[PDB]
Amino acid sequence: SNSITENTSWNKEFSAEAVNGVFVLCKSSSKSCATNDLARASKEYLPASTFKIPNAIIGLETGVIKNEHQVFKERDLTLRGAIQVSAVPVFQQIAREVGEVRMQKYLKKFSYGNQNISGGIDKFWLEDQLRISAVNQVEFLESLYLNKLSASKENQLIVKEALVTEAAPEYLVHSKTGFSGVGTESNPGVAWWVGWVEKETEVYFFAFNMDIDNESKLPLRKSIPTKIMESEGIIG
Amino acid sequence: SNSITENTSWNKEFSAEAVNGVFVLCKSSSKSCATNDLARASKEYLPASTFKIPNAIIGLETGVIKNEHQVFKWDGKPRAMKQWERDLTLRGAIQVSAVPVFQQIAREVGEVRMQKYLKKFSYGNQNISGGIDKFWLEDQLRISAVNQVEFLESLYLNKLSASKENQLIVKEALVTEAAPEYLVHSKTGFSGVGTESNPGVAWWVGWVEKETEVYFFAFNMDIDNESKLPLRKSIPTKIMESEGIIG
């Protein structure tokens, strides 16, 4: 069995910046998750570039992505290079070569959100038909961490290393940002930060999302979760 | 086939700190390497904890290390450093240089398998004599900075005689710095202080993966005082910063 609890110890991190959002933090050894908002933790949002995680695994499994050091046979762009920069055309052509049938098959195997890829093969992760919750993101990342997705162990290891974003002697942070855009005041955009931390022998999975109606607030997608995980003694 | 070229453009990074040492830097591949000291670049030295890289690969390929998520449990007995007195992951044991974890891996691998893999890996003089749990710390095993680059390039390319999975597990365990522009994979080593006339050796070896290019590096220096240990990272870091590789 696994569990989730709602806490209030992190509410001060959101209200100080007037941010509507959710953080989900799961400790692997205890199979326990904590969140500031159970309803928003289960609410499905378009994934935007957090979709580069399953798209990279599917691209490698289908053979569309050549290897860790060269996406396609920029010409010498590495998989990590494509995940960091926007690389809009790169993941568009990966999705096109994968195709709707195989993309649908793998998102069902991965239990990835509502699995609705309607709206166009090269932009459905932005069309707002495909949606995934913060809880679903941490479940998906735990499966990737354990090499339990329906993909080769090698391809899961390649994507795990490509997602490293911070390294310290005591921990490794794997993460991915996403941003749908600013939307409007009545219908704001969504900004994500999802990932996990390998800290000594413990592993912490996390997923953050927030309403955003101004790119001015974009830095908060990393600063709020960073402050929570620093207060928990996980990073920093 | 491979060429080693000696330049003087990094000599001030060494003379400013009164350090006798060598830096080897290769862009893309080991086909062309640059160094401050052609003779020292190929001179073989005790690997010390840089040996944890092949030892980890061999531990995984022999099954002594069961898998990626292996935890090395602390039995509660005294260890030489307090940071080793705890359960450790493979990355944890590598990052804190937990000698006793790797001594037990070496004992379980055994002399016959250890010799076989160092021959497959072309790992320096491949001399493992003197004690299965200390040959890389105080005996006759020797490897040069150029050989370290060649070995790390093979690992980067998944060309060592080991599964691709096991090479990927060790490569992720070696990550030491991450930035949007690059990942640094690296390992330090320090044989000990020796004496003023017969100093020890300190190492920093690794590689830097950028968006479209890779750089392999190996540094070693004479050291007779622990106060000089920080130079094993500061000299090569200053060189790679001046080359626009990191920072």
Residue numbers in the entry:
A (entry chain B): 19 to 91, 103 to 265
B (entry chain A): 19 to 265
Task: Quote the study on this structure.
Natural and laboratory-selected variants of OXA-10 have been identified, many of which differ in the spectrum of β-lactams that they hydrolyze. Both protein structures contained two chains in the asymmetric unit, corresponding to a dimer, as previously described for OXA-10 (14, 24).
One such variant, OXA-14, contains a single amino acid change (glycine to aspartic acid at position 157, G157D) from the OXA-10 parent. The OXA-14 variant has been implicated in clinically significant resistance to ceftazidime. OXA-14 crystallized as a heterodimer in which, much like OXA-10, only one of the two K70 residues was carbamylated. In chain A of OXA-14, the Ω-loop was closer to the active site, and the indole group from tryptophan 154 (W154) interacted with the carbamylated lysine 70 (K70) (3.2 Å), as was described in OXA-10 (14). The interaction between W154 and K70 is critical for both the activity and the stability of OXA-10 (25). In chain B of OXA-14, K70 was decarbamylated, causing an open confirmation, consistent with what was observed for the heterodimeric structure of OXA-10 (14). We observed an increase in nitrocefin hydrolysis for OXA-14 as the pH value increased, suggesting that K70 was more stably carbamylated at a higher pH. Compared to strains expressing the pPSV37 vector control, the expression of OXA-14 resulted in a 16-fold increase in the ceftazidime MIC and an 8-fold increase in the ceftazidime-avibactam MIC in PAO1 and a 16-fold increase in the MICs of both antibiotics in PA14, consistent with previous reports.
